[PDB]
Amino acid sequence: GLTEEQRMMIRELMDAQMKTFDTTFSHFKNFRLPGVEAAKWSQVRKDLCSLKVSLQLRGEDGSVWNYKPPADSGGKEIFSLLPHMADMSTYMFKGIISFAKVISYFRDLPIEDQISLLKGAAFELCQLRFNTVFNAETGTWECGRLSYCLEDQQLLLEPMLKFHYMLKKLQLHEEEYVLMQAISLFSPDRPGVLQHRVVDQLQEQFAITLKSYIECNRPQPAHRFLFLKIMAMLTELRSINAQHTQRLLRIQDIHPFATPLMQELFGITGS
Amino acid sequence: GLTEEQRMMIRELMDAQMKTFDTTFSHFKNFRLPGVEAAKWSQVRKDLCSLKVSLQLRGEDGSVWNYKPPADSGGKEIFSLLPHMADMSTYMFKGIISFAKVISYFRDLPIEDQISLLKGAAFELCQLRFNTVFNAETGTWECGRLSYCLEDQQLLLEPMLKFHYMLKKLQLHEEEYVLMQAISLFSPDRPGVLQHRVVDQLQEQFAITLKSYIECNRPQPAHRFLFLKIMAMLTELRSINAQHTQRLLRIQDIHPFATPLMQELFGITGS
Ligand SMILES: C#C[C@]1(O)CC[C@H]2[C@@H]3CCc4cc(O)ccc4[C@H]3CC[C@@]21C
Ligand SMILES: C#C[C@]1(O)CC[C@H]2[C@@H]3CCc4cc(O)ccc4[C@H]3CC[C@@]21C
C-alpha cells in the first residue's frame, strides 16, 4: 500500500544504512582504553555516575579482557572511560555522516544546511543505531567484539536508559529504524538551518512513509498507535540530545576530552 | 637452642629478604600485557598449555581489568602472555639478585662464583618467593595489584603446580623460606662453580641452621620430619628448574621473548 515514491524512499535509506552501518564494528580500531568551580565538579560528578558500564573485549584469538570501572572517590578516576567513549562516539559519528551523505534528499540540500542538520542530529542517529545492538535482557550494547554492560530499575530513571529499553520493546523493523533516522536527520528546526521549508517537507514525507509502512505491514493490536509511539520517542530523543549535549559541555569545561570531530559537531572552536 | 652464629645467620637472611622482597609488588611497573621444526611447535604447544592462568589487575582507583587467555587454535595466540610473564620474572630476578648481593656469605664469594650461583638458582629462589604469595584455596598467586589465577586436580599433575601446593601445605615460617632460599642459592654443584668446597660448607651450615631452627621451634607431631620434607622439596625444585629451563629454551628457539636479564641468566648469548 506504499506508493512507488515511498518504496523508493525506503530503499534509498536502507541502501544508505547497509553501506554505512558497520554492525559488527569490525573497523572500529585503535581506540583508547582506561589506564592500567567546585559546583561544576559536583554536577559533572552527578552527570557521569548516572550511566555506569563495564566493558568487555573479545579478542580475535578467543581471549577476553573485562574492565570494571572505579567507584567515585572524589578524583579524576570518574573520567577513566571518557577517552574510550569519545573514540567510540567518534567512530559512530563517521558512520552517521557517511549515511547522510549517501542519501539523495540530503546531498541535494545546500552544504551549509547539511552541516547544520548533522550537527543537530548526529547524536540522535548514533543512539538510534546503538539501540539496534542493545540487548534489553542483559542490559548490554553488543558492539561486535566490544560489549558495554550496564552495572547493577533505578536504572530506568535515567532518561537515556529508559529510552533504549522503551524503544527496544517496540520491536521495530530495520526499515522503521532507518525511517526514524531520516525523520531525526531532516528536522527543519535545528540551529542554523536555512532551507526550513524544504527540510520540513522532506521530514513530512519520511513521516508519511513511516506511517504508511506501519499501516501496510503491522495489523496486530500490539501495534496500534505504533506510529504515534515512534514519533513520541523521537521527541524524547531530541530532549535527551539536548540534555547530553549539556552534560558533554559541562565535562569539557573542566576536563577536556572531545575529539576534533566531536568538537566540530558540538560547536567547540578550539579557542 | 640455636647458636649465636645460627641466630646471626637467620637475622642476615631475614634482613636480606626484608630489604629486597617487594611483597606488594608495588614497584613492578611498565610491564607488557596481552594484545587487544613442526615437532618443535608440537612440544612447545604442549609445554605452554600445561600452565594456564587468567590475570587480574586491580587499579589504584578501584577499577579492575581481567584477562582470560585464548584456547590453543594452532597459532601464535599461545604466546600471548609470554611478554608479560617475561617482565614479571625479570622483575623477580632483580629482587633475587639484590637479595643475594646483600648477604655477607655471598658477597665474600669470588664474583665468578656469585654469577654462577645466581645463574643456577635464580629461578628456584623466584619460585620460593612466589610460593609465599600463593593462595592454595583459590589457586592464585596474589602479587599485590596483580593476580594470577589457575584456570579450571589434573592440575596437580603439573610438577610446578604440585610443588606450590605441597610446599604451601607445609605452612612454613618466613625464616624457613629464607633458609630454603639460602640452601638453593649456595648449591655447590651448579655449572661453573669454582669454590665447590667453600660453597658446599656454606650450604651445609644453612641446612644445619634450618634443621636446628625446626627442632627449636616446632615440637608438634605434624612437623616430624619437616626438615627432611623441605630438603626433598628443594631437590624437587631443582628438577623443576631443569625442566622449566628446557621449556624456556624450546620456546625461545621458535619464538624469541626472553628479556636481556633472562638471556644473561639462562645463557643466551644474543648470537
Ligand atoms: C556525563 C555524563 C554521561 O552521562 C556519562 C558519559 C557521558 C558521555 C561521554 C561520551 C560522550 C560522547 C558524545 O559524543 C556525546 C556525549 C557523551 C557523554 C554524554 C553524557 C554521558 C553519557
Ligand atoms: C612453556 C611453558 C610454560 O610451562 C608455560 C609458561 C612458561 C614460562 C614462561 C615465562 C618464563 C619465565 C622464566 O624466567 C622462566 C621460564 C618461563 C617459562 C617456563 C615454562 C612455562 C611455565
Numbering used by the authors:
A (entry chain A), B (entry chain A): 142 to 177, 195 to 310, 316 to 434
What do the study authors state?
In all cases, the PXR-LBD adopts the canonical active conformation, with the C-terminal activation helix H12 capping the LBP. Whereas EE2 could be precisely placed in the electron densities obtained for both the PXR–EE2 and PXR–TNC–EE2 complexes, TNC could be positioned unambiguously in the ternary complex only. EE2 binds closely adjacent to H12 with a binding mode that is reminiscent of that seen for 17β-estradiol, both in presence or absence of TNC. The 3-hydroxyl group on the A-ring of EE2 forms an hydrogen bond with S247 (helix H3), whereas the 17β-hydroxyl group on the D-ring is hydrogen bonded with R410 in helix H11 and the main chain oxygen atom of D205 from helix H2'. The position of R410 is further stabilized by a network of hydrogen bonds involving S208 (helix H2') and E321 from the loop preceding H7. The remaining contacts between EE2 and the protein involve van der Waals interactions with several hydrophobic residues. The particular position of EE2 in a restricted region of PXR LBP leaves a significant portion of the pocket unoccupied and available for additional interactions. TNC bound to PXR in a 1:1 molar ratio, while EE2 was found to interact with the receptor with 1:1 and 1:2 binding stoichiometries. Our study shows that individually, EE2 and TNC are too small to make all the necessary interactions ensuring high binding affinity and effective stabilization of the active conformation of the receptor.
